[PDB]
Amino acid sequence: SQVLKIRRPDDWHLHLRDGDMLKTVVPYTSEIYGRAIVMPNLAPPVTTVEAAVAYRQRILDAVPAGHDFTPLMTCYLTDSLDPNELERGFNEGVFTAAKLYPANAVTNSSHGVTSVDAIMPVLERMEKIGMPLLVHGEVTHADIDIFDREARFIESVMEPLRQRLTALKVVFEHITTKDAADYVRDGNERLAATITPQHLMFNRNHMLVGGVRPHLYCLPILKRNIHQQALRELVASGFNRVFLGTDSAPHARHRKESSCGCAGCFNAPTALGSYATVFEEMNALQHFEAFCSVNGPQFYGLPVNDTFIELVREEQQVAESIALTDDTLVPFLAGETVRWSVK
Amino acid sequence: SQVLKIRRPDDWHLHLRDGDMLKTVVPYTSEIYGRAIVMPNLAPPVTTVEAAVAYRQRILDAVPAGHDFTPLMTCYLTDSLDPNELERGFNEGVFTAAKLYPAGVTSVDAIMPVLERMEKIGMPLLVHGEVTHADIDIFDREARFIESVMEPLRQRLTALKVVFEHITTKDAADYVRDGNERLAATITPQHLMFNRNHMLVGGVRPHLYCLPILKRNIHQQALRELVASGFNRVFLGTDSAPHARHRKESSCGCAGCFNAPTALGSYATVFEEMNALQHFEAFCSVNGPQFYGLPVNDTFIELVREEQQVAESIALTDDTLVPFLAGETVRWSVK
Ligand SMILES: NC(=O)N[C@@H](CC(=O)O)C(=O)O
Ligand SMILES: O=C1C[C@@H](C(=O)O)NC(=O)N1
Ligand SMILES: [Zn+2]
Ligand SMILES: [Zn+2]
Ligand SMILES: [Zn+2]
Ligand SMILES: [Zn+2]
Known part of the structure; x- marks a missing residue:
């Protein structure tokens, strides 16, 4: 059976949650990835240096013995966040980046952003100091169709923001449309993107034809096939x-x-082999290592990992579920036979 | 305060299921509607007069004393169905109409003799109008059906009476509006009240998931x-x-x-919002009978504009049933 050896990957967009759930899920990441960008959307969100420090430690506490895993923390951008607090966290190595979730005029100032214009002081500061901005790029106005929300964000927010702050480094997270694919393709060295395995493997038909499948339900919402193919x-x-x-x-x-x-x-649990499957189907395995292990480091200005992992092209069944303290988690591709697994 | 008195309505597209489910759900229809078109997609489907007769009696068995409700039975069209069976059931007063589900039927071409018979005898055809090829995006399946199946069919069988069931698009709305007297449509409360955002923003809401799939807002507006x-x-x-x-x-x-349990008041709210209550009775109680060539009901009911809370669930023998709009407050109630 075929082997694919790559430099140890990293995950540039991850939710690890907290408490018991964190304990359950961390190992699925730490066994494989050297680093991950840990998102800040806890309840309440991580909006201070002290919270990020404490959360980082809870994550490290839950890493199994011998996994070489480093969480890269983020700050949740809010109206009330002090730009000095964000700067101090960046300067002390606590915050690797800051995350901007969709604006909403009714959000509490402690939990989010009302409008992008309203947090310009903090964004200017990130531009000044060279801190990357991670964007969940959707506009969430009630009158905008859910399938249009990403495209609308490009026009209404992304392009004006980048024109306003010409030195700002931005990751367009989890892109899902041809609109975003073209936009990123046509951008400069200060614009990058991440892509999930589900948005490469599936389109909205998979979530809605023959049944509604909430395990494929995620934001930004799965789009039509033309968008999948662009990704x-x-x-x-x-x-x-x-x-x-x-x-x-x-x-x-x-x-x-x-x-x-x-x-x-x-x-x-299944992402890496899923990405391998997609790159193989696209006759593009020569670009697979860079996607997993090189491009992200280069954009963030961090070293590429110097250890390796092996994927083997041997069929395996994915677990139907994974136990939590209470209830269970259903992994992506649960119960399925997958083509590539980690050796 | 505001009271609205209408001729008793009918429901021209209903699933009553079978067994204990049927027992549970029949009363929510029989208490209000004088008649209903009972769809035939049982497992196995209702494809013979004999099965239709038996099913009709199970339905009647489950109707509470004092509800004057008549189920109008339908035949599930199959590639292989004998035109003589369908005609016999029509002639015996058993089948009111036949229902075309897309593969269901593999092609309109395979069932031509059945369709030609319906045309000759005056039996309406009820169409679930979606194409099903795996590669066609789910939101496009209704519009694609119009072009590739509906319009060719109607041009070939010009005398056939067709109801375009549960339409969900401006495409279908425009098509029906511009059609002749042999084409009609039904519309559900959900496709008037909501669009796909209501199913997908803030969470996925499977109780709003139905076919044809809820569409974008411009389609909701067209309906x-x-x-x-x-x-x-x-x-x-x-x-x-x-x-x-x-x-x-x-x-x-x-x-x-x-x-x-909530459809009639939900429709009232829509018509009220569209400043169109003067057309509410005809939609509920006149237009269907006219298309089907059946008399209008000779009794009347009243809706009052008093806010009722919808039950969170309805008990079944096993599990519960979650009604549409569960836990929500509805604006109009049946007096
Ligand atoms: N529409 C639905 O979403 N469901 C109907 C089938 C139908 O009308 O096609 C059913 O019988 O469950
Ligand atoms: O933007 C998001 C948030 C994430 C989560 O649950 O944290 N889930 C998603 O599907 N996308
Ligand atoms: Zn995320
Ligand atoms: Zn996100
Ligand atoms: Zn139906
Ligand atoms: Zn249908």
Whole structure:
């Protein structure tokens, strides 16, 4: 059976949650990835240096003995965040980046951003100091169709922001459209993107035809096939400012399979082999290592890992579920036979 | 305070299921509607007169004393169905119409002799109008059906009476509006009240997941304008399609809204919002009978504009049933 050896990868977009759930999910990441960008959308969010320090330690506490894993912390951008607090966290190595979630005029100032214009002092500071901005690029106005929200963000927010702050480094997280693929392809060295395995492997038909499948329900929402194909083409092209970001985003089974299912795929356990499957199908395995292990480091100005891992092209069954203290997690591709697994 | 008195309505598109489910759900229809078109997608489907007769009696068995409700039975069209069986059931007063589900039927070409018979005898054809090829995006399946199946069919069988069931697009709305007297449509409450955002923003809501899939807002608006205009070949058809809670709320949720308990008031709210209450009775109680060549009901009911809370769930023998709009407050109630 065929082997693919790559420099140890990193995950440039990860949700690890907290408490018991954190304890359950960390190992799926730490066994494989050297570093991950740990997102700050805890309840309450990580908006201070002290919280990020404490959260980093809880994550390290949960890493199994012998895994060489380093969490890269982020600050949740809010209206009330002091730019001095963000700067101090960056300067002390606590915050690797800051994350901007969709604006909403009714958000509490302690929990989010009302408008992008309103946090310009903090954004100017990030530009000044060279701190990268990670963007969940959707506009969430009630009158905008959910499938249009990413495209609308490019026009309304992304392009004006980058024109306003010409030195700002930005990762367009988990892109899902041809709109975003083209935009990123056509950008400068200060614009990059991450892509999840689900947005490469599936489109909205997989989530809605024959049944509604809440384990494929995630934001930004799966788009039509033309968008899926654009994403696949982009990673297959060798374009070097797209990189691995799983957006592994675990929710208990009962919170997924409910009257109002939570958004997010728990894909940490199966992401890497899923990406290998996509690059192989695209006859583009020569660009697979760079996607997983080189492009992200280069954009963040961090070293490439100097250890290796091996994927083997031998069929394996994915677990149907993974136990939590209470309830269970259903992994991405649960119960399926997958083509590539880690040796 | 405000009271609205209408001729008793009918439901021209209903799923009653079978067994204990049927027992549970029939009363929500029989208490209000004089008649309903009972769809034939049982497992196995109703494809013979004999099965239709038996099913009709199970339905009648489950109707509470004092409800004057008549189920109008339908035949599930199959590639192989004998035209003589379908005609016999029509002639015996058993089959009111036949229903075309897309593969269901593999092609309209395979069932031509059945369709030609329906045309000759005056039997309406009820169409679930979606193409199903795996590669066609789910949101495009209705519009694609119009071009590739509906319009060719109608041009070939010019005398055939067709109801375009549960339409969900401006495409279909425009098509029906511009059609002749042999084409009509039903519209559900969900496709008037909501669009796909309501199913997908803030969470995935499987109780709003149904086929044809909820579409974007411009399509919702087209349907609302269609009913509100007074156009007289669109009529009430709930597509009440109940599934146990944990078949809805699962890793692969079933399609269908259990809307029988709340549909009528929900429609009232829509027409009221569209400033079109003067057309509400015809949609509910006149347009269908006229298309089907059946008399209008000779009794009347009243809706009052008093806010009722919808039950969170309805008990079944096993599991529960979550009604459409569960836990929400509805603006109009049946007095
Ligand atoms: N529409 C649905 O979502 N469900 C209906 C089938 C139908 O009307 O196609 C059902 O029978 O469950
Ligand atoms: O933006 C997001 C948030 C994430 C989560 O659950 O944290 N889940 C998602 O599906 N995408
Ligand atoms: Zn996000
Ligand atoms: Zn995320
Ligand atoms: Zn249907
Ligand atoms: Zn139906």
